[PDB]
């Protein structure tokens, strides 16, 4: 009922009151965009609370944030976002892969920028590219990714480059399969693209089926 | 990587950060973890240079070599020491950066209304700090651990009419007449 598979988005809750309590106490500097290194190294959160989904900002009883506060955390709650954003702050939800979670906490072991891989596809669906969290790819996704190749037709809109010199099915077995599919599914508009008739029921291919926008 | 205000490269999204130069911060906790970190990098060099001073003649035969195998010391210098310098440098910047702002704040602020009130506007003089720094000044509370000796409560301890005894050897010996203790019921 609450299983955690390999790649589950379970984030430890950093109540906003904690983060707001620190910033006045003086453990955190309000100027420097308070990425999770500061939270870890200032003994705001220990080792035993930063696991792979990095964290989650929760507006717990915080009805107001007084000063312009900048944060680079992972998946703030929608109220916690609209609280920082009212006081002139920011929140660019970084959703780093595990390889990125290390090189952010112990950068004193990485003398030069060792390239960081984009997060799992499940993360890109929900946080990294989703402007609702101001994910750090919500700029790139709309700018560069969401556009297909300048040669792709309708069927090959998802290939890195259109694998044929023509959108249409290539050979007979790619055709008769699509000539039967488009009628197996009653004739829908996009049903031309053959799809597999079996749901793996995997959590990776699961994106928010219903929710806000 | 973050670790300083420059913003981690995760400002791939061109998230700007306006309304700046906005805060004077004394870097209190950061200067603390600097003096803590500066102690480590020196407490690490002390280790990277440990060299046999065998005050005994049993195993004196290594008194010239380092106390760490050449391959290991050649590692520990690079694994833990040179890491601790970066970790020391990081605080040596998160503070040298925050000072730059304070240097700008403490000028544009000194002008407006007073060069006297200025270092009061930027102060943190809580009314009780005399408790922690100069406890001789503090009266408004009784924060001694041996409270029965606070001047407002010294009148608890009894002032025995003592005396010396040269016949006993200069032993001090109280002249209180002991009260006959309770005995039976």
């Amino acid at each position: 009922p609450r299983n955690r598979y390999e790649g589950k988005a379970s984030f430890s809750r950093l109540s906003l009151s904690k983060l707001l309590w620190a910033v006045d106490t003086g453990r955190l500097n309000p100027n420097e965009t308070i990425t999770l290194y500061h939270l870890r190294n200032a003994k705001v959160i220990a080792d035993r609370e930063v696991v792979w989904p990095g964290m989650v900002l929760l507006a717990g009883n915080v009805e107001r944030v007084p000063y312009p506060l900048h944060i680079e955390l992972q998946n703030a709650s929608a109220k916690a976002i609209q609280l920082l954003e009212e006081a002139g702050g920011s929140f660019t939800n970084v959703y780093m892969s595990h390889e990125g979670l290390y090189q952010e906490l112990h950068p004193e072991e990485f003398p030069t920028f060792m390239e960081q891989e984009l997060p799992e596809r499940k993360g890109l669906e929900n946080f990294a590219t989703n402007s609702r969290k101001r994910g750090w790819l919500a700029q790139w996704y709309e700018d560069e990714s969401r556009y297909a190749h300048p040669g792709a037709g309708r069927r090959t809109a998802h290939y890195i480059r259109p694998p044929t010199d023509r959108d249409f099915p290539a050979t007979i077995e790619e055709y008769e399969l699509a000539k039967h599919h488009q009628k197996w599914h009653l004739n829908q508009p996009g049903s031309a693209t053959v799809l597999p008739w079996h749901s793996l029921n995997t959590a990776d291919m699961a994106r928010r089926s219903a929710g806000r926008l | 990587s973050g670790a300083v205000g420059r913003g981690s490269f995760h400002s791939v999204v061109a998230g700007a950060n306006p309304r700046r130069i906005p805060t004077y911060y004394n870097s209190a906790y950061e200067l603390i973890q600097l003096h803590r970190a500066h102690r480590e990098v020196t407490r690490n060099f002390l280790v990277r240079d440990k060299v046999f001073d065998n005050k005994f003649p049993g195993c004196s035969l290594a008194n010239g070599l380092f106390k760490m195998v050449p391959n290991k010391r050649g590692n520990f210098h690079t694994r833990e020491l040179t890491e601790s310098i970066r970790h020391r440098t990081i605080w040596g910047q998160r503070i040298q950066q925050q000072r730059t702002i304070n240097a700008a704040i403490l000028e544009d602020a000194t002008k407006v209304l007073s060069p006297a009130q200025m270092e009061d506007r930027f102060s943190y003089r809580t009314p009780d700090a005399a408790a922690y720094f100069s406890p001789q000044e503090y009266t408004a509370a009784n924060n001694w651990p041996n409270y029965w000796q606070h001047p407002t409560e010294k009148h608890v301890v009894p002032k025995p009419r003592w005396r010396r005894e040269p016949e006993l050897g200069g032993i001090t010996r109280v002249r209180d007449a002991v009260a006959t203790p309770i005995a039976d019921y």
Binding site: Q139 | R6, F9, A14, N17, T89, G92, Q93, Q96
Partner: peptide, 22 residues
């Protein structure tokens, strides 16, 4: 995507172990 804010400040910090003058 270049880094507009604090573009400098990487080359201006941690005068390593301040020398005899300071």
């Amino acid at each position: 995507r270049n880094r507009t804010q604090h573009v400098l400040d990487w080359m201006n910090y941690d005068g390593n172990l301040p020398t005899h003058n300071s």
